Symmetry: C3
Subunit: 194 residues, 3 copies
């Protein structure tokens, strides 16, 4: 079962929303660790559930690696208002954030370290690759494959059956209308390589 307290690493803005989700899940206390100007991570800390509240995908992956290596459990934070299909797969204890009013439909799969931000939608049979960030209000239609480390900006979307290659960025408001097997930064409606 979940611990009484939770370490949230990242005490910035993203950290504050993560705190709200942890409290929603029933955690009694959130202990912020921030190496910058709060309490530092220490490998010697008393054991509690961890969460990595870092928006940057590259840095979130590295921190995730360092925390995991010290034997800490990095839990998922999933708001109770997120609607997740009984046939969707969400990787267990994998540092995944699922914000309020997120919807994940039948047979979608969410990989480790993903952020599904506020009111995002992952349609049936999607695969969202590890340490991707689907940001506020971004939506993936049915059967969309998002590669590892991808970032879908605010209010972006991807049409059905499409793939976005690892390490790509879909800009805020962009509409991806063609399959993308080579990485890049895509902006506009329709989305075009920058």
């Amino acid at each position: 079962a979940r611990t009484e307290k939770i370490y949230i690493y990242g005490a910035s803005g993203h950290g504050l929303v993560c705190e709200d989700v942890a409290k929603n899940m029933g955690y009694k206390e959130c202990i912020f660790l921030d190496d910058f100007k709060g309490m530092k991570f220490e490998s010697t800390l008393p054991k509690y559930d961890f969460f990595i509240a870092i928006g940057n995908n590259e840095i979130r992956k590295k921190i995730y690696q360092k925390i995991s290596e010290n034997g800490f459990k990095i839990v998922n934070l999933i708001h109770k208002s997120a609607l997740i299909s009984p046939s969707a797969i969400v990787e267990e204890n994998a540092g995944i954030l699922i914000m309020p009013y997120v919807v994940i439909n039948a047979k979608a799969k969410i990989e480790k370290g993903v952020i599904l931000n506020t009111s995002s939608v992952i349609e049936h049979e999607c695969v969202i690759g590890e340490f991707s960030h689907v940001s506020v209000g971004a939506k993936c239609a049915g059967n969309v494959k998002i590669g590892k480390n991808c970032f879908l900006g605010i209010n972006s979307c991807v049409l059905p059956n499409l793939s976005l290659a690892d390490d790509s960025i879909l800009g805020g408001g962009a509409t991806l209308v063609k399959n993308q097997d080579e990485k890049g930064v895509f902006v506009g409606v329709p989305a075009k390589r920058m």
Copy 2:
């Protein structure tokens, strides 16, 4: 009252989400009919509620006609998280799909065979024409008239008071800013004839 079981015609991706909505409504068993590589529709089937889980508007209308002609009741599937104004009108037993977190505001009207997909919004006093599909995250502002058989793509929107003519397509991410009395395919921000 609803039957114990339901026939869902279409066993594809759209079918899977329809299954989830039926289960949410309290149906105990979903029986998939798919003429393609599952159990075939037969006019001789034992009577249960039917739903037509076909995304294509033209084909959904034809199947709806064939099922209705055999005397089957084609129910609405409405997720419990959909928020529907007490003054909105949703045509009864009319094969309408209303997905999670859909909002339908005061005095809007939804006609037979419509799909309102995940997190779509139908504002006050809208009329959504029969066998239209308002897809994931698409939004109609107040007093918008969507014609029969129309398709609003992912994350599209229509400004207040506007009409979209029968058999039109508003592309993914498109923003309709002018009245459209002649049918077509409209894409972009602002939306322009293709």
Copy 3:
């Protein structure tokens, strides 16, 4: 505590949705005042909570001023499905509308007379200026400052950390990607001065 009845000023479309929110909050009766072709406002009316259901920001501010001057309390109408962070600040008894499925995240501030329309999202640490209208499905990313009297159109968004100057309009579907210190009308993806 809230009164038994409420005066809703504006009996148009916006008024109808306001009625729905008031009923959701537990008000027993909504009394429409419309100077146009319903019951007129009178300074002599029996005291009840008031709400100003006027979509136009300029007119809503003026009416708000006139009603306040006569000593009436102009309450907030907040749908129960709106998700508001315990650390967000919503100005009390300030004529604010918060529609269904609105999300307001940690430390955001909402000022008097604001409309947050259906399924809009205000991310952590935003400031939404008085008598602004964030319309249906519009989303502000973290740390966004919206000026007084601003109007964000249907399905628009603003990227993190940005400001929109007082009295500006972000058009339906627009994506604001740069800081804006001078007022104007911005349209497109990316949003550009009209």
